[PDB]
PDB file of N, CA and C in Angstrom:
ATOM      1  N   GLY A   1      34.666  33.088  95.486  1.00  0.00           N
ATOM      2  CA  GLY A   1      34.620  32.248  96.667  1.00  0.00           C
ATOM      3  C   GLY A   1      33.346  31.430  96.748  1.00  0.00           C
ATOM      4  N   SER A   2      33.478  30.167  97.138  1.00  0.00           N
ATOM      5  CA  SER A   2      32.329  29.276  97.249  1.00  0.00           C
ATOM      6  C   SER A   2      31.366  29.764  98.329  1.00  0.00           C
ATOM      7  N   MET A   3      30.160  30.135  97.913  1.00  0.00           N
ATOM      8  CA  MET A   3      29.147  30.619  98.844  1.00  0.00           C
ATOM      9  C   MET A   3      27.777  30.040  98.506  1.00  0.00           C
ATOM     10  N   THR A   4      27.245  29.224  99.410  1.00  0.00           N
ATOM     11  CA  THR A   4      25.942  28.604  99.206  1.00  0.00           C
ATOM     12  C   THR A   4      24.818  29.514  99.690  1.00  0.00           C
ATOM     13  N   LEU A   5      23.770  29.632  98.883  1.00  0.00           N
ATOM     14  CA  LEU A   5      22.628  30.471  99.229  1.00  0.00           C
ATOM     15  C   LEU A   5      21.494  29.634  99.811  1.00  0.00           C
ATOM     16  N   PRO A   6      20.591  30.295 100.551  1.00  0.00           N
ATOM     17  CA  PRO A   6      19.442  29.632 101.175  1.00  0.00           C
ATOM     18  C   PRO A   6      18.411  29.171 100.150  1.00  0.00           C
ATOM     19  N   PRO A   7      17.460  28.337 100.600  1.00  0.00           N
ATOM     20  CA  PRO A   7      16.400  27.808  99.737  1.00  0.00           C
ATOM     21  C   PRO A   7      15.400  28.882  99.323  1.00  0.00           C
ATOM     22  N   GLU A   8      15.158  29.836 100.217  1.00  0.00           N
ATOM     23  CA  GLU A   8      14.222  30.920  99.942  1.00  0.00           C
ATOM     24  C   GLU A   8      14.572  31.622  98.634  1.00  0.00           C
ATOM     25  N   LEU A   9      15.844  31.973  98.480  1.00  0.00           N
ATOM     26  CA  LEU A   9      16.311  32.653  97.276  1.00  0.00           C
ATOM     27  C   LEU A   9      16.195  31.742  96.058  1.00  0.00           C
ATOM     28  N   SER A  10      15.905  32.338  94.906  1.00  0.00           N
ATOM     29  CA  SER A  10      15.765  31.580  93.667  1.00  0.00           C
ATOM     30  C   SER A  10      16.872  31.941  92.682  1.00  0.00           C
ATOM     31  N   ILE A  11      16.776  33.133  92.104  1.00  0.00           N
ATOM     32  CA  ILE A  11      17.769  33.600  91.144  1.00  0.00           C
ATOM     33  C   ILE A  11      18.985  34.188  91.853  1.00  0.00           C
ATOM     34  N   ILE A  12      20.126  34.168  91.172  1.00  0.00           N
ATOM     35  CA  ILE A  12      21.360  34.702  91.735  1.00  0.00           C
ATOM     36  C   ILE A  12      22.327  35.125  90.635  1.00  0.00           C
ATOM     37  N   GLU A  13      22.995  36.255  90.845  1.00  0.00           N
ATOM     38  CA  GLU A  13      23.951  36.769  89.871  1.00  0.00           C
ATOM     39  C   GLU A  13      25.106  35.792  89.674  1.00  0.00           C
ATOM     40  N   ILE A  14      25.460  35.548  88.418  1.00  0.00           N
ATOM     41  CA  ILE A  14      26.548  34.634  88.094  1.00  0.00           C
ATOM     42  C   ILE A  14      26.963  34.769  86.633  1.00  0.00           C
ATOM     43  N   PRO A  15      27.765  35.802  86.338  1.00  0.00           N
ATOM     44  CA  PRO A  15      28.251  36.065  84.980  1.00  0.00           C
ATOM     45  C   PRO A  15      29.262  35.022  84.515  1.00  0.00           C
ATOM     46  N   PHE A  16      29.986  34.441  85.466  1.00  0.00           N
ATOM     47  CA  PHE A  16      30.988  33.429  85.153  1.00  0.00           C
ATOM     48  C   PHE A  16      30.368  32.275  84.371  1.00  0.00           C
ATOM     49  N   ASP A  17      29.075  32.053  84.580  1.00  0.00           N
ATOM     50  CA  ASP A  17      28.362  30.980  83.895  1.00  0.00           C
ATOM     51  C   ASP A  17      28.284  31.252  82.396  1.00  0.00           C
ATOM     52  N   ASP A  18      28.144  32.523  82.037  1.00  0.00           N
ATOM     53  CA  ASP A  18      28.056  32.916  80.635  1.00  0.00           C
ATOM     54  C   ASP A  18      29.404  32.751  79.939  1.00  0.00           C
ATOM     55  N   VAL A  19      30.451  33.295  80.552  1.00  0.00           N
ATOM     56  CA  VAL A  19      31.794  33.209  79.993  1.00  0.00           C
ATOM     57  C   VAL A  19      32.306  31.773  80.010  1.00  0.00           C
ATOM     58  N   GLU A  20      31.847  30.999  80.990  1.00  0.00           N
ATOM     59  CA  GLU A  20      32.260  29.606  81.118  1.00  0.00           C
ATOM     60  C   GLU A  20      31.453  28.711  80.180  1.00  0.00           C
ATOM     61  N   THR A  21      30.155  28.602  80.446  1.00  0.00           N
ATOM     62  CA  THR A  21      29.275  27.777  79.630  1.00  0.00           C
ATOM     63  C   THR A  21      29.420  28.116  78.151  1.00  0.00           C
ATOM     64  N   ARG A  22      29.137  29.368  77.805  1.00  0.00           N
ATOM     65  CA  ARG A  22      29.235  29.819  76.422  1.00  0.00           C
ATOM     66  C   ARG A  22      30.689  29.839  75.959  1.00  0.00           C
ATOM     67  N   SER A  23      30.951  29.206  74.819  1.00  0.00           N
ATOM     68  CA  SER A  23      32.300  29.148  74.270  1.00  0.00           C
ATOM     69  C   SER A  23      32.313  29.596  72.811  1.00  0.00           C
ATOM     70  N   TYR A  24      31.282  29.205  72.070  1.00  0.00           N
ATOM     71  CA  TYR A  24      31.174  29.564  70.661  1.00  0.00           C
ATOM     72  C   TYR A  24      30.784  31.030  70.500  1.00  0.00           C
ATOM     73  N   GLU A  25      29.624  31.390  71.041  1.00  0.00           N
ATOM     74  CA  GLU A  25      29.136  32.761  70.957  1.00  0.00           C
ATOM     75  C   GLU A  25      29.089  33.407  72.339  1.00  0.00           C
ATOM     76  N   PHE A  26      30.171  33.252  73.095  1.00  0.00           N
ATOM     77  CA  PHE A  26      30.254  33.818  74.436  1.00  0.00           C
ATOM     78  C   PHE A  26      30.461  35.329  74.376  1.00  0.00           C
ATOM     79  N   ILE A  27      29.718  36.054  75.206  1.00  0.00           N
ATOM     80  CA  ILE A  27      29.820  37.508  75.249  1.00  0.00           C
ATOM     81  C   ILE A  27      30.306  37.986  76.613  1.00  0.00           C
ATOM     82  N   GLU A  28      31.343  38.816  76.608  1.00  0.00           N
ATOM     83  CA  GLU A  28      31.902  39.346  77.847  1.00  0.00           C
ATOM     84  C   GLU A  28      32.549  40.708  77.613  1.00  0.00           C
ATOM     85  N   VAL A  29      31.824  41.768  77.960  1.00  0.00           N
ATOM     86  CA  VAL A  29      32.326  43.126  77.788  1.00  0.00           C
ATOM     87  C   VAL A  29      31.746  44.063  78.842  1.00  0.00           C
ATOM     88  N   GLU A  30      32.513  45.087  79.202  1.00  0.00           N
ATOM     89  CA  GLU A  30      32.074  46.055  80.201  1.00  0.00           C
ATOM     90  C   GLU A  30      31.661  47.368  79.540  1.00  0.00           C
ATOM     91  N   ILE A  31      30.616  47.991  80.076  1.00  0.00           N
ATOM     92  CA  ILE A  31      30.123  49.253  79.540  1.00  0.00           C
ATOM     93  C   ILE A  31      30.808  50.440  80.209  1.00  0.00           C
ATOM     94  N   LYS A  32      31.886  50.916  79.595  1.00  0.00           N
ATOM     95  CA  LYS A  32      32.632  52.051  80.128  1.00  0.00           C
ATOM     96  C   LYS A  32      33.022  51.810  81.582  1.00  0.00           C
ATOM     97  N   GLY A  33      33.455  50.588  81.880  1.00  0.00           N
ATOM     98  CA  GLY A  33      33.854  50.252  83.234  1.00  0.00           C
ATOM     99  C   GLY A  33      32.747  50.491  84.241  1.00  0.00           C
ATOM    100  N   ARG A  34      31.503  50.344  83.797  1.00  0.00           N
ATOM    101  CA  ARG A  34      30.352  50.550  84.666  1.00  0.00           C
ATOM    102  C   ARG A  34      29.355  49.402  84.530  1.00  0.00           C
ATOM    103  N   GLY A  35      28.906  49.158  83.303  1.00  0.00           N
ATOM    104  CA  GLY A  35      27.954  48.089  83.061  1.00  0.00           C
ATOM    105  C   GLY A  35      28.632  46.767  82.757  1.00  0.00           C
ATOM    106  N   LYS A  36      27.831  45.741  82.493  1.00  0.00           N
ATOM    107  CA  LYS A  36      28.360  44.417  82.187  1.00  0.00           C
ATOM    108  C   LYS A  36      27.543  43.746  81.086  1.00  0.00           C
ATOM    109  N   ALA A  37      28.211  42.939  80.268  1.00  0.00           N
ATOM    110  CA  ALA A  37      27.547  42.236  79.179  1.00  0.00           C
ATOM    111  C   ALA A  37      27.931  40.761  79.162  1.00  0.00           C
ATOM    112  N   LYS A  38      27.058  39.920  79.708  1.00  0.00           N
ATOM    113  CA  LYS A  38      27.305  38.485  79.756  1.00  0.00           C
ATOM    114  C   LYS A  38      26.153  37.713  79.119  1.00  0.00           C
ATOM    115  N   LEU A  39      26.390  37.188  77.922  1.00  0.00           N
ATOM    116  CA  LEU A  39      25.372  36.426  77.207  1.00  0.00           C
ATOM    117  C   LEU A  39      25.852  35.005  76.926  1.00  0.00           C
ATOM    118  N   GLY A  40      25.293  34.042  77.652  1.00  0.00           N
ATOM    119  CA  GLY A  40      25.676  32.655  77.465  1.00  0.00           C
ATOM    120  C   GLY A  40      24.482  31.722  77.451  1.00  0.00           C
ATOM    121  N   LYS A  41      24.746  30.429  77.289  1.00  0.00           N
ATOM    122  CA  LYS A  41      23.684  29.430  77.258  1.00  0.00           C
ATOM    123  C   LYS A  41      23.139  29.170  78.659  1.00  0.00           C
ATOM    124  N   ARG A  42      24.042  28.965  79.611  1.00  0.00           N
ATOM    125  CA  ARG A  42      23.650  28.707  80.992  1.00  0.00           C
ATOM    126  C   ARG A  42      23.733  29.981  81.828  1.00  0.00           C
ATOM    127  N   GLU A  43      23.501  31.121  81.184  1.00  0.00           N
ATOM    128  CA  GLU A  43      23.551  32.408  81.870  1.00  0.00           C
ATOM    129  C   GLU A  43      22.893  33.497  81.028  1.00  0.00           C
ATOM    130  N   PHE A  44      22.447  34.559  81.691  1.00  0.00           N
ATOM    131  CA  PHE A  44      21.797  35.670  81.005  1.00  0.00           C
ATOM    132  C   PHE A  44      21.818  36.928  81.868  1.00  0.00           C
ATOM    133  N   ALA A  45      22.880  37.716  81.731  1.00  0.00           N
ATOM    134  CA  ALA A  45      23.021  38.948  82.497  1.00  0.00           C
ATOM    135  C   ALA A  45      23.816  39.990  81.718  1.00  0.00           C
ATOM    136  N   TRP A  46      23.134  41.045  81.286  1.00  0.00           N
ATOM    137  CA  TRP A  46      23.778  42.113  80.527  1.00  0.00           C
ATOM    138  C   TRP A  46      22.958  43.396  80.591  1.00  0.00           C
ATOM    139  N   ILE A  47      23.380  44.321  81.447  1.00  0.00           N
ATOM    140  CA  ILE A  47      22.684  45.593  81.601  1.00  0.00           C
ATOM    141  C   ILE A  47      23.646  46.697  82.023  1.00  0.00           C
ATOM    142  N   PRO A  48      23.571  47.843  81.330  1.00  0.00           N
ATOM    143  CA  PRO A  48      24.426  48.999  81.615  1.00  0.00           C
ATOM    144  C   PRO A  48      24.077  49.665  82.941  1.00  0.00           C
ATOM    145  N   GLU A  49      24.541  49.071  84.037  1.00  0.00           N
ATOM    146  CA  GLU A  49      24.276  49.608  85.366  1.00  0.00           C
ATOM    147  C   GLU A  49      25.441  49.323  86.310  1.00  0.00           C
ATOM    148  N   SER A  50      25.308  49.767  87.556  1.00  0.00           N
ATOM    149  CA  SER A  50      26.350  49.564  88.555  1.00  0.00           C
ATOM    150  C   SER A  50      26.296  48.146  89.117  1.00  0.00           C
ATOM    151  N   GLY A  51      25.083  47.623  89.270  1.00  0.00           N
ATOM    152  CA  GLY A  51      24.916  46.280  89.797  1.00  0.00           C
ATOM    153  C   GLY A  51      25.061  45.216  88.727  1.00  0.00           C
ATOM    154  N   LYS A  52      24.553  45.506  87.534  1.00  0.00           N
ATOM    155  CA  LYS A  52      24.627  44.566  86.422  1.00  0.00           C
ATOM    156  C   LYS A  52      23.849  43.292  86.735  1.00  0.00           C
ATOM    157  N   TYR A  53      22.755  43.437  87.473  1.00  0.00           N
ATOM    158  CA  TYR A  53      21.924  42.298  87.842  1.00  0.00           C
ATOM    159  C   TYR A  53      20.498  42.474  87.331  1.00  0.00           C
ATOM    160  N   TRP A  54      20.369  43.073  86.152  1.00  0.00           N
ATOM    161  CA  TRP A  54      19.061  43.303  85.551  1.00  0.00           C
ATOM    162  C   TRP A  54      18.187  44.161  86.459  1.00  0.00           C
ATOM    163  N   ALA A  55      18.803  45.139  87.115  1.00  0.00           N
ATOM    164  CA  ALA A  55      18.081  46.031  88.012  1.00  0.00           C
ATOM    165  C   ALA A  55      17.762  47.356  87.330  1.00  0.00           C
ATOM    166  N   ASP A  56      18.639  47.777  86.425  1.00  0.00           N
ATOM    167  CA  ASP A  56      18.451  49.029  85.701  1.00  0.00           C
ATOM    168  C   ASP A  56      17.061  49.091  85.075  1.00  0.00           C
ATOM    169  N   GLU A  57      16.611  47.963  84.533  1.00  0.00           N
ATOM    170  CA  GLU A  57      15.299  47.890  83.901  1.00  0.00           C
ATOM    171  C   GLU A  57      14.485  46.731  84.468  1.00  0.00           C
TER     172      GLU A  57
END
C-alpha cells in the first residue's frame, strides 16, 4: 500500500526494490520462513531475523 513517510525519517525498509530493480543478479529468498534475503542495485536488505531490517546485527 502507498504510504508516504515524514521528512525526519531517512532510511526505510523496501525489499521490493531489490527484486524489482535487480533483474540480472536479483536475490530473493527466505531463511526458514523467518529471515529475508534481498540483494539488488537499488536495494540492500538481507538478514536472518524476524524484522529483516538489518536489526539482527
